[PDB]
Design an enzyme around this catalytic site. Structure first.
Site, PDB file in Angstrom:
ATOM      1  N   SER A 106     -15.019  -1.187  -2.553  1.00  0.00           N
ATOM      2  CA  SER A 106     -13.578  -1.208  -2.340  1.00  0.00           C
ATOM      3  C   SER A 106     -13.153  -0.096  -1.392  1.00  0.00           C
ATOM      4  CB  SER A 106     -12.856  -1.064  -3.681  1.00  0.00           C
ATOM      5  OG  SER A 106     -13.211  -2.115  -4.563  1.00  0.00           O
ATOM      6  N   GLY A 107     -12.310  -0.452  -0.424  1.00  0.00           N
ATOM      7  CA  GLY A 107     -11.909   0.464   0.619  1.00  0.00           C
ATOM      8  C   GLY A 107     -12.848   0.536   1.799  1.00  0.00           C
ATOM      9  N   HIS A 157      -5.939   0.840  -4.804  1.00  0.00           N
ATOM     10  CA  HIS A 157      -6.264   0.844  -6.227  1.00  0.00           C
ATOM     11  C   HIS A 157      -7.270   1.932  -6.574  1.00  0.00           C
ATOM     12  CE1 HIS A 157      -9.584  -1.744  -4.682  1.00  0.00           C
ATOM     13  NE2 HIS A 157     -10.265  -1.116  -5.623  1.00  0.00           N
TER      14      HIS A 157
END
Ligand code: CA
Ligand code: CA
Ligand code: CA
Ligand code: CA
Ligand code: CA
Length: 377
Positions: A326-327, A183
Site C-alpha cells: 500500500s502506497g 490509510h
C-alpha cells in the site's frame, strides 16, 4: 527480337533494344543486370516519368512501369514528396522524450524537473548526477515477479512503526517528500521511512532512515470506499540521493492520460506480502502488470470505482498487487524514463482469477501534490 540467328549472335542493346520492341532478355542480356534492365524496361514502353522532375523537396525520382517512386527526406511524406510530415503527440509522441505539447499545429517538447531541453529541441539532458526515474524454478509464494537489483529500484521506500515492522511503501519525489496511501497513517501512530531498502533482515549500508515530520492526507478520504486514499510525508531529515536512493519524475496530467496510460505494461515495486494472507517479503520485489480496460474494471468490482482508481493486473495469471504494498508507486517505463501513473490502493484477494489490483490515479491528484510540496515548504 527473338530469332534463331539474332539471339544466336551476342545480343546488343543497340542491335535489339532500339529498332525492335525491346521486349526482354535482349533488354537484359547486354545489360546483364536486374539493377539496370528494370530501369530500362520502363523507359521504352511507357516512357520516363521522371523527365518532368515530379519529386519536389529535392527528392529522388526512380522510374517504374506506369508510375514513379519518390524518395523524400526527413519530415517529408506524401505521394510526390509535396507534404511536410505533420508532427503530433499521437504519432511517435511528437519526438519528445518527457513532455509533448500541441500549440498552433506545432509540437513543443519540454522536460520535467532535473532535465533541460536539448539544443535540437527534442532530447532532455539530465541536470544532475542522479535525476529522477533514471536507473544506474522459483516456487514458494512468487507471483511471476523478479527481485529488485541495485540501482534498478531506488525509488522505493518502506514505512516501519515503533517496532520496526514494514506496513506500507513510499515513492521518493524529492529530497524531503514521500508519497504513500492515506490509510497507512491509521495503521501506526508514529513511523519512520527507510529509503534504499534491499532486505529488512540485512543492513547493506545503503538504507537511510528518516523520521516523519509533516503528514498530509487527502481531506476527502472515505473509509467505506477507500476513495481519495493518498498521503504525503515530509521527512525531518533531507534525502541525499545516491546509488540505491533516487527519486521519480512526476508527469503531466494530460500527457499521462494520453500517452503513459496507453502503454501496454507498467511496473509496481513493494515489500508487501508474497501471497494472500501470507508472510511479508523479506526483500523488495517488483511486478510488471498491464493496464485493464475500464468497462471490465467496473464490471468486475463489487465496490464503487471512481475516476481516481483503475484496475491493473492479469485476469488469469497469479500476478497481482497484495497487502503490504500500500502506497507503492505504479510506474510506466517510457523510452528512457520511469513515470509514476498510479499508486497501490487495494485488491480483492491476491493472485485471484477475475480480480485486478485497484491503483489510485496519480494524474487527478498531481495538482494537489504540488500544493503539498509548496504549502509547507
Ligand atoms: Ca541481347
Ligand atoms: Ca539479344
Ligand atoms: Ca542506332
Ligand atoms: Ca541485335
Ligand atoms: Ca539486323
Amino acid at each position: 527480337a527473338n530469332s534463331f540467328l539474332e539471339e544466336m549472335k551476342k545480343g546488343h542493346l543497340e542491335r535489339e533494344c532500339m529498332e525492335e520492341t525491346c521486349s526482354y532478355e535482349e533488354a537484359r542480356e547486354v545489360f546483364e543486370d536486374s539493377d539496370k534492365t528494370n530501369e530500362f524496361w520502363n523507359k521504352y514502353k511507357d516512357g520516363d516519368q521522371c523527365e518532368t522532375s515530379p519529386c519536389q523537396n529535392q527528392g529522388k525520382c526512380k522510374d517504374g512501369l506506369g508510375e514513379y517512386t519518390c524518395t523524400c527526406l526527413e519530415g517529408f511524406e506524401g505521394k510526390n514528396c509535396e507534404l511536410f510530415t505533420r508532427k503530433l503527440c499521437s504519432l511517435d509522441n511528437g519526438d519528445c522524450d518527457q513532455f509533448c505539447h500541441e500549440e498552433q499545429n506545432s509540437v513543443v517538447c519540454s522536460c520535467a524537473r532535473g532535465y533541460t531541453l536539448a539544443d535540437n529541441g527534442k532530447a532532455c539532458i539530465p541536470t544532475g548526477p542522479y535525476p529522477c526515474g533514471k536507473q544506474t524454478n522459483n516456487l514458494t509464494r512468487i507471483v511471476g515477479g523478479q527481485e529488485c537489483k541495485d540501482g534498478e529500484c531506488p525509488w522505493q521506500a518502506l514505512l516501519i512503526n515503533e517496532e520496526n515492522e514494514g506496513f506500507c511503501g513510499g515513492t521518493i519525489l524529492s529530497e524531503f517528500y514521500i508519497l504513500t496511501a492515506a490509510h497507512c497513517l491509521y495503521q501506526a501512530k508514529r513511523f519512520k521511512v527507510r529509503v534504499g531498502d534491499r532486505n529488512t533482515e540485512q543492513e547493506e549500508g545503503g538504507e537511510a532512515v528518516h523520521e516523519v515530520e509533516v503528514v498530509i492526507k487527502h481531506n476527502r478520504f472515505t473509509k467505506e470506499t477507500y476513495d481519495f486514499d493518498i498521503a504525503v510525508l515530509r521527512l525531518k531529515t533531507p534525502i541525499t540521493f545516491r546509488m540505491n536512493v533516487a527519486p521519480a519524475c512526476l508527469p503531466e496530467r494530460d500527457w499521462a492520460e494520453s500517452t503513459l496510460m496507453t502503454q501496454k505494461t507498467g511496473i509496481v515495486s513493494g515489500f508487501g506480502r508474497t501471497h494472500e494472507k501470507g508472510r511479508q517479503s523479506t526483500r523488495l520485489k517488483m511486478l510488471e502488470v498491464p493496464y485493464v480496460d475500464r468497462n471490465s474494471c467496473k464490471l468486475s468490482s463489487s465496490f464503487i470505482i471512481t475516476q481516481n482508481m483503475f484496475c491493473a493486473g492479469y485476469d488469469t495469471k497469479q500476478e497481482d498487487a497484495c497487502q503490504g504494498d500500500s502506497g507503492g508507486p505504479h510506474v510506466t517505463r517510457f523510452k528512457d524514463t520511469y513515470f509514476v501513473t498510479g499508486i497501490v490502493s487495494w485488491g480483492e484477494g491476491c493472485a485471484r482469477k477475475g480480480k485486478y489490483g485497484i491503483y489510485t490515479k496519480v494524474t487527478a491528484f498531481l495538482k494537489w501534490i504540488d500544493r503539498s510540496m509548496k504549502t509547507r515548504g
